[PDB]
Each structure stands twice: as C-alpha cells, then as structure tokens.
C-alpha cells in the first residue's frame, strides 16, 4: 500500500503545516500537524475542556462506530516550545491520503495549553518520530507510520514541504519526479527516539564550505533552523544590521537587508536554503525589525533541522531495519 497527502502552510510565514487526516467511521477529517520530532497522535476532541477549544475541529469518539476506549490509558506531553496537552486514548481507524491503519491509538485531549487553543488552524498532531517516545501509559502505543510500515510497498515516508506553498507527505514510495539529482542517504541514530543525523558542515551565501560535524534532528514539527551559536553567529554576521535581541529572544534584522543563502552538508552533497526562506517577517505588525529563521540551539540541548531547512529539500525518512535519512535538492 501507499498513501499521499497534501500538506498546507497554516499562514503566510510557513509557521507550520497541516495535513488532512480521516479518523473514525464515518470519517471525521481533522487537520493535523505532522511532526517527525514527536510520537503521539493526539486530537482536539469532544472531551477537550470547552474553554480551551477556539475554532478547532474536534474528534467525537462516540460518533465513530469503530472507536474503542483504550481502557486505563492516559497520555501527557510537553513540547520544546513549552506547550503541552494530555488526556485519554481510543483506538480507531485512521487514514492519510488513501493509506488506512486500523486500531491506531488516537489520543483524545482533555487539556491543551494556551498555545494550542490560540491556533485555530491545528486540530492536533500526528507524530512520526520513533514509537519509543510515545507517551501513552501504561502501554506505549505505536505511531501511524510504525503501524502502517509492514503493509507499505517500501517502509518509508517522505516530506516535501513547500516554501509559501503546499507540499506533500508520501507513505510507502519515493516519487522520483519530486526532486532533482540524486538522494544522498545518511546514518540515523535512534538512541534519543528522533531522526537524528550528522550534517557534514555549512556555508553562508557564496562563502567557502566549513567541514564540521553538526549532530541534529530532522523535525517537521519545528518551524525554524536551530544550530550551534558559532554557526548562527557566522550567518548573521553577513547580514547588515542583524543583531541578537534578548527582548525578542533571538536574531533579528532590518527588513531592508538581503539575506544570504545557507548551505548544509549531507555527506558529500549540499542542500541550499535560499535567503528568502530565512525571513519570518516583522517581529510585530508594522515593525521594520524582522525575525530570523536561523537561531541558536544553545540551551535547547540539541540542534534542530526544522522546516526552514527541510523545505529546501526532498526528505526521505527510511524506516528500514536500520533507519536512514535521505536528502535531495528539488
């Protein structure tokens, strides 16, 4: 089997991407944030505290003939941005772009933090990291990909995120028309439950490539590119007027400046992030100060190849017995 679904930016800045997902019988379609940095499929629901729902589409298990309470199961998650949610668990039929899993754990939110409430466009998350990070207790549950894997033509999914445009998540096949050149594959460590890999270095604009190992995660659920402070400083030093603002909480730059590209290494290959991808617009409406899309990972404790980086590539998440990551230009 295979599946193919279009993923759409939630706003004009590509702050996140939503993908339609069918849950239950008859289908209830929710727009979920596909997140390769976490491993819970959770949704706004009929059980979510009313004051914490503000425009989202909810899953109502009682209206699904295939929904079954996973008795005694609870879940609770906190994300790197300080957001959180928690609740109980059902199993139900879940389909993504034609690909169907029966008995998928669908984690029903009883509580969500303000960040989620305030984002009317995201109805929940669909985690695509390794199932070892799944928070369901007492019995850890498998991700949608893990459950689908054996049925897939090939045990892979791919992320092809658009710049200010829709893109595609595919399951079970590699669309050879979707990228240029070849796909370069690189080793993955699953020891922390992430799609963790080591970039071979970087360049800033037309500058010479610096060979240096950068360990980080491929995370579709994180907006920006978070790299070591040395790397980030070298980038913004090439932008006139750029500075790190403690009050804003990262690097900002005058919107009149031109941003250089940023290149990162995948083995001997190179992915180029165009300068425009690194512009996340005014810090506040009407401001001439713009927020940068490359920020320091210092104090996160891990480097994150988020959407800024990933949307410059066609990315293969290979869930073969020994997982790997593939990157191609497009």
């Amino acid at each position: 089997s295979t599946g193919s679904a279009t993923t759409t930016p939630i706003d004009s800045l590509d702050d996140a991407y939503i993908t339609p997902v069918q849950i239950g019988t008859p289908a209830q379609t929710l727009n979920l944030d596909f997140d390769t940095g976490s491993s819970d499929l959770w949704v706004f629901s009929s059980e979510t505290t009313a004051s914490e729902v503000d425009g989202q589409t909810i899953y109502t298990p009682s209206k699904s003939t295939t929904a079954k309470l996973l008795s005694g199961a609870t879940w609770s998650i906190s994300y790197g941005d300080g957001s959180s949610s928690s609740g109980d668990v059902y199993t139900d039929t879940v389909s993504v772009g034609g690909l169907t899993v029966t008995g998928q754990a669908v984690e029903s939110a009883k509580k969500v933090s303000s960040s989620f409430t305030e984002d009317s466009t995201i109805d929940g998350l669909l985690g695509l990291a390794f199932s070892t990070l799944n928070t369901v207790s007492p019995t850890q549950q498998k991700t949608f990909f893990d459950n689908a894997k054996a049925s897939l033509d090939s045990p892979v999914f791919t992320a092809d995120l658009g710049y200010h445009a829709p893109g595609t998540y595919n399951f079970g096949f590699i669309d050879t028309t979707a990228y240029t050149g070849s796909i370069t594959y690189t080793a993955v460590s699953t020891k922390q439950g992430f799609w963790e890999w080591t970039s071979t270095g970087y360049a800033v604009g037309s500058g010479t490539f610096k060979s240096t190992s950068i360990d980080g995660i491929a995370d579709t659920g994180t907006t920006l590119l978070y790299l070591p402070a040395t790397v980030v400083s070298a980038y913004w030093a090439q932008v006139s007027g750029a500075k790190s603002s403690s009050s804003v909480g990262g690097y900002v730059f005058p919107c009149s400046a031109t941003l250089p590209s940023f290149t990162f290494g995948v083995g001997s290959a190179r992915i180029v992030i165009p300068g425009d991808y690194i512009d996340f617009g005014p810090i506040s409406t009407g401001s001439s100060s713009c927020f940068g899309g490359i920020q320091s990972s210092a104090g996160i404790g891990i480097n994150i190849f988020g959407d800024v980086a990933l949307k410059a590539a066609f990315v293969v998440f290979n869930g073969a017995t020994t997982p790997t990551l593939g990157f191609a230009s497009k």
Side-chain angles (χ1 to χ4, degrees), residues 1-62 64-67 69-109 112-141 143-148 150-190 192-242 244-330:
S1 63
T2 61
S4 182
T6 296
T7 191
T8 301
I10 63 163
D11 63 28
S12 69
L13 301 170
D14 297 346
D15 281 317
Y17 299 76
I18 49 172
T19 309
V21 177
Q22 283 69 49
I23 309 176
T25 310
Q28 304 179 36
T29 299
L30 276 64
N31 295 328
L32 305 186
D33 185 354
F34 282 26
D35 179 13
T36 60
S38 72
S39 304
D40 287 50
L41 194 175
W42 74 260
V43 298
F44 279 79
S45 71
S46 56
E47 301 179 331
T48 310
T49 302
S51 65
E52 299 181 348
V53 186
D54 181 10
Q56 294 82 10
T57 294
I58 60 165
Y59 167 62
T60 306
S62 68
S64 175
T65 59
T66 42
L69 178 71
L70 190 65
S71 180
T74 60
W75 63 278
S76 177
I77 192 162
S78 308
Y79 298 101
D81 67 347
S83 68
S84 68
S85 53
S86 66
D88 52 22
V89 187
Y90 296 81
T91 56
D92 211 341
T93 304
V94 174
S95 300
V96 175
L99 169 70
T100 301
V101 169
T102 55
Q104 176 65 46
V106 174
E107 300 170 38
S108 167
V112 303
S113 66
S114 55
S115 172
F116 286 112
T117 300
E118 292 163 357
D119 186 358
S120 68
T121 73
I122 290 173
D123 300 325
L125 267 65
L126 187 149
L128 291 169
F130 292 89
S131 293
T132 53
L133 294 178
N134 176 266
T135 76
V136 178
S137 174
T139 310
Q140 261 204 330
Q141 300 294 302
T143 70
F144 174 82
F145 177 54
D146 256 16
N147 281 324
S151 306
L152 294 175
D153 290 2
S154 184
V156 308
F157 67 92
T158 66
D160 181 11
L161 303 177
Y163 168 66
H164 295 170
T168 306
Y169 281 102
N170 290 328
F171 293 83
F173 71 105
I174 289 157
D175 179 359
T176 62
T177 72
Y179 57 88
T180 65
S182 55
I183 306 179
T184 296
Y185 288 87
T186 195
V188 164
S189 169
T190 62
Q192 295 189 100
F194 302 117
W195 293 91
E196 192 175 356
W197 64 291
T198 300
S199 172
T200 47
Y202 70 101
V204 179
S206 59
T208 58
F209 186 87
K210 174 77 169 172
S211 291
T212 186
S213 297
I214 303 170
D215 182 289
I217 67 170
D219 184 0
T220 59
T222 291
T223 312
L224 307 182
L225 174 54
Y226 294 90
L227 293 172
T230 50
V231 179
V232 178
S233 186
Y235 178 79
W236 288 108
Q238 298 304 310
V239 182
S240 210
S244 182
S245 169
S246 61
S247 51
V248 180
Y251 283 88
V252 294
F253 67 96
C255 312
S256 59
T258 297
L259 298 180
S261 63
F262 183 90
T263 300
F264 63 92
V266 185
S268 54
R270 307 287 181 253
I271 300 296
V272 179
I273 305 171
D276 287 348
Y277 290 27
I278 297 162
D279 178 9
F280 276 77
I283 63 174
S284 290
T285 307
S287 180
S288 68
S289 181
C290 283
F291 202 65
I294 296 176
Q295 300 291 345
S296 178
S297 67
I300 298 175
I302 199 161
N303 299 305
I304 307 173
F305 295 87
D307 298 334
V308 164
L310 302 181
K311 75 189 170 186
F314 179 87
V315 192
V316 182
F317 295 77
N318 170 29
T321 312
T322 293
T324 64
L325 276 172
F327 292 84
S329 299
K330 63 186 185 189

